[PDB]
Amino acid sequence: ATKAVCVLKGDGPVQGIINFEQKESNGPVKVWGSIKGLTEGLHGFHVHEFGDNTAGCTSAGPHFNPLSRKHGGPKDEERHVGDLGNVTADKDGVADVSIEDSVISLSGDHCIIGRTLVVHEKADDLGKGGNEESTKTGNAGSRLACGVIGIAQ
Amino acid sequence: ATKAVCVLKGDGPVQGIINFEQKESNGPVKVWGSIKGLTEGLHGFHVHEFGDNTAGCTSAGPHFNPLSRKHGGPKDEERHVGDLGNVTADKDGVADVSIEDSVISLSGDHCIIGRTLVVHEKADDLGKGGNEESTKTGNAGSRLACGVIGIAQ
Ligand SMILES: [Cu+2]
Ligand SMILES: [Cu+2]
Ligand SMILES: [Zn+2]
Ligand SMILES: [Zn+2]
């Protein structure tokens, strides 16, 4: 009955709280919460490798990718472990996050705990961009707000 | 060669960066870094249970204590896993942290990764206080600055 939580923060107005809940060690992880201060529309949303906030969000490194694969959408089989795809922001800048994912986990090889969650400038093209970069970052742009994923009560 | 890192931050002037490095899974963890904005003298210094920063440092919960023991100094056998004792601050407010500890770990049962590090108002009395509270918190007072412990490169 594992739970985790993460406080997203950054240099600008983007901030929020995102919760994690994995009922069973082998099972899927529900991800939910509310991010605000976001430019209206789609935003990239990924778990990055390092829980390092030394030099801001940049220190977090690249997309969490322990199985050494190419970038993709969450439904895609060929994806990064940390590729949680997009989150959608409404008029007044709020994004009411509600994802459910089976690749990430709060335990084991795929353990995201102690690593960084990151919301992004532009939308994640889910790897279907055609250019070189789309296969890596998703062309989702700069890092607006981020936070280290922590064990929750 | 597992490494971790943590950015200590808070409501007031206290801030800093603390590094972790465990060369071997079964071995001790070197803790080092630099905290500043500290009142001159001793300060309590502990790993708390939860990586929760929702409602500030208070969300972190109590001292990390999976073996259900009483508070103590780091050298004491009867201690909390997360009891790293004290850190010393010099005149100009700076505390050059350099601990080495064998109870905490960056892997397994004692895994501190994904949990919160916390620097304190007063000094930790290392459980020798005689009162009720010294057996729990170390009488080290309020939480000045804290941060979630994250996986580092
Ligand atoms: Cu990303
Ligand atoms: Cu403490
Ligand atoms: Zn990716
Ligand atoms: Zn304690």
Residue of B52, B112, B118, B149 to mutate, testing the A interface (most A Cβ within 10 Å of its Cβ): B52
Using what technique was this structure determined?
X-ray
Which own/partner pairs from B1-4 qualify as long-range (CB within 8 Å, at least 24 positions apart)?
B2/B106, B2/B107, B3/B106, B3/B151, B3/B152, B3/B153, B4/A51, B4/A114, B4/B106, B4/B112, B4/B113, B4/B149, B4/B150, B4/B151, B4/B152
Asked whether residue A43 is marked as a ligand-binding residue, the answer is no
Q: Which residue range is the domain that position B18 belongs to?
A: 1-153
Q: How many CB pairs under 8 A join A and B?
A: 81
CATH (domain of A97): 2.60.40.200
CA distances from B141 to B52, B82, B119, B123 (A): 19, 16, 10, 8
Q: What is the DSSP letter of B117?
A: E
Where in chain B does DSSP place strands (E)?
Answer: 2-8, 15-22, 29-36, 41-48, 83-89, 95-101, 116-120, 143-148, 150-151
For residue B145, how far is its CA from the centre of ligand 2 (angstroms)? 10
For residue B88, how far is its CA from the centre of ligand 1 (angstroms)? 38
Annotated binding site of B for Zn(2+), which residues? Answer: 63, 71, 80, 83
Please name which ligand lies nearest the alpha carbon of A127: 3
Q: What CA–CA distance (Å, rounded) separates B91 from B36?
A: 11
Give the experimental resolution in Å: 3.5
Q: Using the structure block, give the residue that is written with the tokens 């050494």.
A: A68
Phi and psi of A97, rounded to 5°? -70, 130
Kindly give the pairing relationship between strand A116-120 and strand A150-151.
unpaired
What angle (nearest 5°) sits at the alpha carbon of residue B37, between those of residues A12 and B125? 125
For residue A5, which residues of chain B lie inside 8 Å, CB to CB?
51-54
Provide the domain count of chain B: 1
Identify which of B54, B61, B149 has the shortest CB distance to residue A7. Answer: B54
- What would the 3-class secondary structure string for B20-56 be? EEECCCCCCEEEEEEEECCCCEEEEEEEECCCCCCCC
Please name which ligand lies nearest the alpha carbon of B87: 2
Q: Hey, are the CB atoms on A151 and B54 less than 8 Å from each other?
A: no
